[PDB]
């Protein structure tokens, strides 16, 4: 991805040999920057609504003629708007993004009838998985605000048209916008962005209201639709070793009809439960989480104990074999993330919008058994453990039990 600048907008493109191009606008407008709860989700859903030059209806009918597709999502850091089309149709897509950022008519009926109902279905689909809920709850406990804001719009706190219009006034500005073009000729994209995004406001960098503060605690989301448990450990100094530790501890199987050779995978033997360790770097803080879902609260409780033990055991000693297995699983995870268009866009988006240089999968550091065990030791000896239980919460573990 050759990083450049076109009319004040950071543009990164990588040419390829495929008939398919992906163009993504990455906006610094994720939920950590959200003025009011849920506004970044609503703004994401308000992309490709009526603009002054082109109605939502006309856009969709013309997109069907190009056979293009549209993908949008919100993270804690970004809003990502991606289009996938044939290479030759690049100018149309650039101009479409320009219309969205410059000329969206944010109309009250779109919010009531189109945008908010779709945002609500989006969230309900995600929450069907109790593990999603548990990991969301864990961020809320760990960070409270900023990273602790909900990503998604909720019913209890309604977003108004004035909320969304104000946020868009901040976000849709040259200072908060990065363009990422996969299989796009880099010189051609710079020329097009340079003409189309010239009259976009300059604006100012959106910032998190307040510094990131870490907290421990418990969340007990009582649902009737499945059971899950997250054990998170907030990290004050995000370090790349936690990727290796996440992949080492593992949890999912690398093979059909198997349990797996990872410590966390082996904690689920004899139970219909699954586990996944994940590490979330947010630049200024991190979260190391272990999420366990299952149908039995008794089995979840059983696995949860084994999971925290596994982490303690790792803090004791890692073998050389296990450290190499961690390097391999971690390099692979890095590679596939840079391939997947959704995650790819945000990776270069972070490089462009912040200044965090991307770590190429081929440059992923190999951590010795000493470095891995040291990282696990810090986590086992955390002052601020977070536990989010979802489901039959009376039957799930508590932080002080773990």
């Amino acid at each position: 991805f050759s990083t450049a600048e076109a009319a004040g907008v950071k543009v990164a493109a990588q040419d390829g040999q495929s008939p398919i191009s992906d163009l993504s606008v990455v906006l610094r407008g994720g939920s950590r920057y959200a003025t009011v709860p849920g506004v970044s989700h609503i703004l994401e859903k308000f992309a490709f609504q009526n603009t002054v030059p082109k109605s939502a209806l006309r856009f969709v009918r013309e997109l069907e003629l190009f056979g293009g597709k549209l993908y949008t999502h919100t993270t804690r850091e970004h809003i990502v708007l991606r289009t996938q089309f044939l290479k030759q149709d690049l100018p149309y897509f650039v101009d479409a993004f320009a219309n969205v950022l410059k000329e969206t008519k944010f109309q009250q009926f779109e919010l009531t009838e189109r945008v908010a109902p779709v945002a609500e279905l989006d969230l309900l689909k995600r929450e069907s998985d109790p593990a999603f809920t548990a990991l969301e709850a864990a961020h809320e406990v760990a960070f409270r605000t900023g990273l602790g804001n909900s990503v998604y719009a909720q019913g209890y706190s309604p977003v108004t048209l004035e909320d969304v219009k104000e946020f868009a006034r901040q976000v849709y500005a040259k200072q908060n916008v990065a363009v990422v073009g996969n299989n796009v000729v880099p010189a051609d994209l710079q020329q097009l962005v340079g003409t189309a995004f010239a009259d976009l406001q300059e604006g100012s960098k959106v910032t998190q209201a307040g510094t990131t503060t870490l907290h421990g605690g418990e969340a007990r989301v009582r649902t009737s639709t499945g059971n899950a448990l997250t054990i998170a450990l907030p990290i004050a100094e995000p370090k790349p070793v936690y990727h290796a530790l996440a992949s080492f501890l593992g949890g999912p199987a690398s093979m059909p009809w198997s349990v797996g050779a990872s410590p966390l995978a082996q904690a689920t033997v004899g139970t219909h439960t699954s586990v996944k360790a994940t590490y979330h770097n947010y630049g200024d803080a991190g979260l190391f989480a272990i999420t366990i879902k299952g149908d039995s609260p008794a089995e979840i409780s059983q696995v949860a104990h084994k999971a925290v033990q596994a982490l303690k055991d790792t803090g004791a000693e890692v073998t050389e074999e296990q450290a190499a297995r961690a390097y391999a699983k971690s390099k692979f995870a890095a590679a596939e993330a840079f391939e997947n268009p959704d995650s790819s866009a945000s990776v270069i988006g972070m490089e462009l919008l912040s200044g965090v240089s991307r770590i190429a999968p081929e440059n992923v550091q190999k951590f010795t058994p000493a470095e891995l065990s040291e990282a696990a030791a810090q986590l086992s000896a955390s002052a601020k453990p977070v536990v989010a239980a979802v489901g039959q919460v009376h039957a799930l573990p508590f932080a002080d039990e773990l």
Binding site: E62, F66, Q88, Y92, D95, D188
Partner: protein, 75 residues
């Protein structure tokens, strides 16, 4: 490079356009035949229908040329 999709709006009225209607033109034809045959069948008994239309059809037309003998007709 393509800047714009290439299309036109065809003339339309009450949700009909010429491409669509043209597909149904033959069907209106057959319905018209069906209505014609049916109508003619319904009035086959009317003497004027026989006199003016049916008796004039070649070969077949003699089916409708029938005379009552003057000996058998009170009127």
């Amino acid at each position: 490079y393509v800047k714009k999709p290439s299309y036109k709006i065809v003339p339309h009225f009450l949700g009909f356009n010429i491409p669509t209607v043209s597909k149904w033109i033959p069907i209106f034809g057959i319905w018209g035949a069906a209505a014609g045959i049916g109508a003619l069948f319904l009035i086959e008994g009317v003497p004027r229908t026989r006199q003016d239309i049916l008796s004039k059809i070649p070969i077949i037309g003699e089916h409708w040329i029938r005379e009552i003998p003057a000996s058998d007709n009170p009127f």
